[PDB]
């Protein structure tokens, strides 16, 4: 599958091609708001290994944050904005000297596709509501420093 090639092309970020894509996409997002929706993940490999599935009930938001942690705060922004959505996880996509750009994956527990497909029904439970608020996300656990 092609997603490997995405992974190892992403591995070389400061290379000419990906720095060019960084520098065009940073500007293009700069024209856009602080928070807004993306039609598709710009790093689909990262989204999958963080748990993305391309079907109804998976929402992509691009969040802009000024330079707690920046990733956690960015997650909290969409947490307040999209209360109905539940924050799954986020990842880094782009940055600027003025702002850092992150892509967050949110899941709707109301769409029957998520409510069915018992692989993901677990997020429908009320106990998972606002994981980012309680630091239960990946960055939340990392900042809390919970490991063995």
């Amino acid at each position: 599958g092609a997603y490997k090639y995405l992974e190892e092309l992403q591995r070389k970020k400061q290379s000419d091609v990906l720095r060019f894509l960084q520098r065009v996409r940073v500007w293009e997002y700069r024209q856009k708001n602080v928070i807004h929706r993306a039609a598709r993940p710009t790093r689909p490999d990262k989204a999958r290994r963080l748990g993305y599935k391309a079907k109804q009930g998976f929402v992509i938001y691009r969040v802009r944050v000024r330079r707690r942690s920046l990733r956690a705060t960015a997650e909290e922004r969409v947490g307040r904005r999209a209360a109905n959505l539940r924050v799954l996880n986020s990842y880094w996509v782009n940055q600027d000297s003025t702002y850092k750009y992150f892509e967050v994956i949110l899941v709707d527990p109301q769409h029957k596709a998520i409510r069915r497909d018992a692989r993901y029904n677990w997020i429908c439970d009320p106990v998972h509501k606002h994981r980012e608020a309680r630091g239960l996300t990946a960055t939340g656990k990392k900042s809390r420093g919970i490991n063995k």
Binding site: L6, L21, V24, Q31, R40, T42
Partner: protein, 187 residues
């Protein structure tokens, strides 16, 4: 509007700044007639729609219905292939006697490797222009890639000659200008 302004501002700065030579391999694409005959070739190898699939399925299920049913063995189907990871999968075998790569993909990094991959593998790849038209010939909105492996004898000579043609028009013409930095002129 905001987004009309953005999209009109998009494609200006990209040409304003120097695009990397891995890009601008795109938009140095197949000429008019050659794309036209490529699509005429493909339109014989449209994949079966979900609707046609279901019609043949109910037909054959009804054929099994009879007492006095009928049992037969049928040959392989023939069609283009179009899914991205599947397209790369038919590469590294190799099985793709042809691959078409759309130029306009918003995550271009999904496709930047495909030209070099098929170059080194020797698959006769071509950069088609417009993912939507690939979608039209494949019962999809968009495809971004179109690989073909198996071809009937009635088109095999056409396939080989088109392969030589694309080798003449794309690999020869644009390899030296695939080989330079594009853009960089202000707008």
């Amino acid at each position: 509007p905001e987004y009309v302004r953005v999209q009109r501002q998009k494609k200006i700065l990209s040409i304003r700044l120097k695009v990397p030579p891995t890009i601008a391999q795109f938009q140095y694409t197949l000429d008019r007639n050659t794309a036209a005959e490529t699509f005429k070739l493909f339109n014989k190898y449209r994949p079966e729609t979900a609707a046609e699939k279901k019609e043949r399925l109910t037909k054959e299920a009804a054929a099994v219905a009879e007492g006095k049913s009928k049992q037969d063995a049928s040959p392989k189907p023939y069609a283009v292939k179009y899914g991205l990871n599947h397209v790369v999968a038919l590469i590294e075998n190799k099985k793709a006697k042809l691959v078409l790569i759309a130029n306009d993909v918003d995550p271009i990094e999904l496709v930047v490797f495909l030209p070099a991959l098929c170059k080194k593998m020797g698959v006769p790849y071509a950069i088609v222009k417009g993912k939507a038209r690939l979608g039209t010939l494949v019962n999809q909105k968009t495809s971004a890639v179109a690989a073909l492996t198996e071809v009937r004898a009635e088109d095999e000579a056409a396939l080989a000659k088109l392969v030589s043609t694309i080798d003449a028009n794309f690999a020869d013409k644009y390899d030296e200008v695939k080989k330079h930095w594009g853009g960089g002129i202000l707008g």
